[PDB]
Design a protein around this ligand. Structure first.
Ligand SMILES: Nc1nc2nc(C(=O)N[C@H](C(=O)O)c3ccccc3)cnc2c(=O)[nH]1
Ligand SMILES: Nc1nc2nc(C(=O)N[C@H](C(=O)O)c3ccccc3)cnc2c(=O)[nH]1
Length: 263
């Protein structure tokens, strides 16, 4: 019932990845909510369960497939299916716990991890921070295989956690940020894997705050500046939505939009 978007790492190109991310964004946002040219994801409040998730089917050169489930309100990867088994992160609340019962209902084996799916928890289990985990087509190819083989005991827990970290950034973060999509496109173009630089990390860490600042802004102007980092690690101050239009593709819902004023 939930929409499915397919991507393969097998012979992936800039164009095939671009098509994929565009399709994910199209299934995430409805077009109902666009503020300062930036789309906002659906509000969780009153969102019907039949509209709550999208499915991302990832295939690789090794001829293996896994299906990730993403919550449309935030692009959060809630879990995955590999063949006869499905695995879900420990849900953050009762609503999200109920919601995942509507996913992969035909699967033979249903598991919920005892750990949550946020970066901090996943980094702990991986034994590595995002800053030290390589991203690119190669890492994603390998991540798909690692997720696939988890149920049979072939994949160690740090490897599984690292593989989630790769998937989340290359799918969800790329969907959220044109800038991060661009960074992944570059890695694919040259087939060169590399860990995310401070510009990528700080954007990921600031998505919620940036979304709130934009939505609470006075005609686009922030009440408080937000500090980001450049590629070299130096500080970049954000005062306004304007500079973020080429950077952020989607916002999480944070508040209602204010009415315009008649002049
Ligand atoms: N499974 C999954 N996990 C995710 N985790 C993050 C993720 O941790 N993002 C933030 C960070 O690490 O700075 C964060 C978000 C909420 C509270 C504190 C920090 C961000 N996105 C995702 C995601 O899309 N899927
Ligand atoms: N469906 C679902 N959603 C979850 N969401 C979060 C969680 O931290 N959600 C934040 C939010 O929705 O604003 C957030 C998400 C990604 C990046 C920054 C902030 C954390 N955990 C979950 C979860 O377990 N299930």
């Amino acid at each position: 019932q939930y929409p499915i978007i397919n991507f393969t790492t097998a012979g992936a190109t800039v164009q095939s990845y671009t098509n994929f991310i565009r399709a994910v964004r199209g299934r995430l946002t409805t077009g109902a909510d666009v503020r300062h040219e930036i789309p906002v994801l659906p509000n969780r409040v009153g969102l019907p369960i039949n509209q709550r998730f999208i499915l991302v089917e990832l295939s690789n050169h090794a001829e293996l497939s896994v299906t990730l489930a993403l919550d449309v309100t935030n692009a959060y990867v809630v879990g995955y299916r590999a063949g006869n088994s499905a695995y879900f992160f420990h849900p953050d609340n009762q609503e999200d716990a109920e919601a995942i019962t509507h996913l992969f209902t035909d699967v033979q084996n249903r598991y919920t991890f005892a750990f949550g799916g946020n970066y901090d928890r996943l980094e702990q289990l991986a034994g590595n921070l995002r800053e030290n985990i390589e991203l690119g087509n190669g890492p994603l190819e390998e991540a798909i295989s690692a997720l696939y083989y988890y149920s049979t005991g072939g994949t160690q827990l740090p490897t599984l956690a690292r593989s989630f970290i790769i998937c989340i950034q290359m799918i969800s973060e790329a969907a959220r940020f044109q800038y991060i999509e661009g960074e992944m496109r570059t890695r694919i173009r040259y087939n060169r894997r590399s860990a995310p630089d401070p510009s990528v990390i700080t954007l990921e860490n600031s998505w919620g705050r940036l979304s709130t600042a934009i939505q609470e802004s006075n005609q686009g102007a922030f009440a408080s500046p937000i500090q980001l980092q450049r590629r070299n690690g130096s500080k970049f101050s954000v005062y306004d939505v304007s500079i973020l239009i080429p950077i952020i593709a989607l916002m999480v819902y944070r508040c209602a939009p204010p009415p315009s004023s008649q002049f």
